[PDB]
Design a protein that fits this description.
The complex is a heterodimer of chains A (141) and B (128). With 141 residues, chain A is mostly helical. Chain A has 6 helices and 2 strands; from the N terminus they run H-H-H-E-E-H-H-H. In chain A, helix 1 crosses helix 2. The N and C termini of chain B lie far apart (34 Å). In chain B, strand 2 and strand 3 form a beta hairpin. The chains are: A mainly alpha (141), B alpha+beta (128). Chains A and B meet through helix 1, helix 3 and helix 6 of A and strand 3 of B. The PDB classes it as hydrolase.
């Protein structure tokens, strides 16, 4: 119930849940793990890097499949679409996170891979894991 | 800024809401003055409006060159009418004496209450 009242968040999850599925499948991940990561990086699709650059994983440039780069010291990649940004994430970090289905294990693998250095109340992993669980619920809305 | 006189009865501007958030984050530490850290208030829906009616949203993030992507530490909503501040992923209402003092000042200017924005607050998806 409560989850479904955040219209911005539900809109994002409804928009991209299906396109995330085959990428998650290829990485042996629950779709909510991948979609949850996008929700974290893009503020449920409301951040500028996502809106303007289609970079829903806030990938630093250079990244595979990028069509350009822009500073937001560090440049961020531009992509053709959400899907391409997800494929870029998979290209660079997929092998490192594959099969890490438990949300905490997933977040921990993200840190090990160097996606984020990851080092409020909760630490990096618990915070992301909570977003993944929220996304799972919002998929029902 | 946040002098009572500069707060319009129609509510905080985006800039003022960010200053409220910055006061809120001082109480939680969070490290706002370290290289690579930023607060971003350019969060918009498809029409250019704030994503959560009644609030301005802000992200708190960090770019490290040894990382491969931005790292985000919070997504916050600040009420234009009361300065009520929530982290809307963890669903925590931020607190602290300095923040509460600011909120009472904001409310004395707008004449609005937390109860007045109950519906909008429900729109954060953090309380029944």
């Amino acid at each position: 119930a409560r989850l479904c009242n955040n219209i911005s968040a539900v809109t994002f999850v409804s928009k991209y849940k299906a396109v995330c599925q085959p990428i998650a499948d290829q990485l042996d991940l629950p779709v909510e793990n991948l979609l949850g990561l996008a929700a974290q990086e893009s503020q449920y699709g409301t951040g500028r890097i996502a809106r303007e650059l289609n970079n829903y994983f806030s990938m630093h440039a250079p990244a595979p499949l990028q069509i350009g780069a822009e500073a937001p010291s560090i440049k961020v990649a531009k992509f053709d679409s959400f899907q391409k940004s997800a494929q870029s994430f998979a290209s660079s970090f997929g092998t490192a996170v594959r099969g890490q289905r438990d949300p905490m294990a997933f977040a921990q693998a993200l840190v090990r891979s160097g996606y984020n250095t990851g080092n409020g109340r909760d630490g990096f992993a618990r915070y992301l894991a909570d977003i993944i669980i929220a996304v799972r619920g919002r998929m029902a809305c | 800024s946040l002098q009572p006189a500069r707060i319009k009865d129609s509510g905080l501007t985006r800039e003022q809401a960010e200053q409220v958030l910055r006061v809120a984050l001082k109480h939680q530490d969070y490290q706002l003055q370290r290289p690579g850290v930023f607060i971003d208030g350019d969060l918009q829906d498809e029409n250019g409006k704030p994503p959560h009616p009644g609030y301005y949203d802000f992200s708190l993030g960090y770019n490290d060159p040894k990382a491969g992507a931005t790292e985000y530490w919070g997504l916050f909503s600040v009420s234009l009418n009361t300065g009520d501040t929530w982290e809307i992923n963890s669903c925590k209402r931020l607190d602290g004496a300095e923040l509460r003092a600011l909120q009472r000042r904001v409310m004395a200017r707008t004449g609005k209450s937390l109860a007045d924005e109950k519906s909008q607050r429900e729109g954060l998806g953090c309380e029944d």
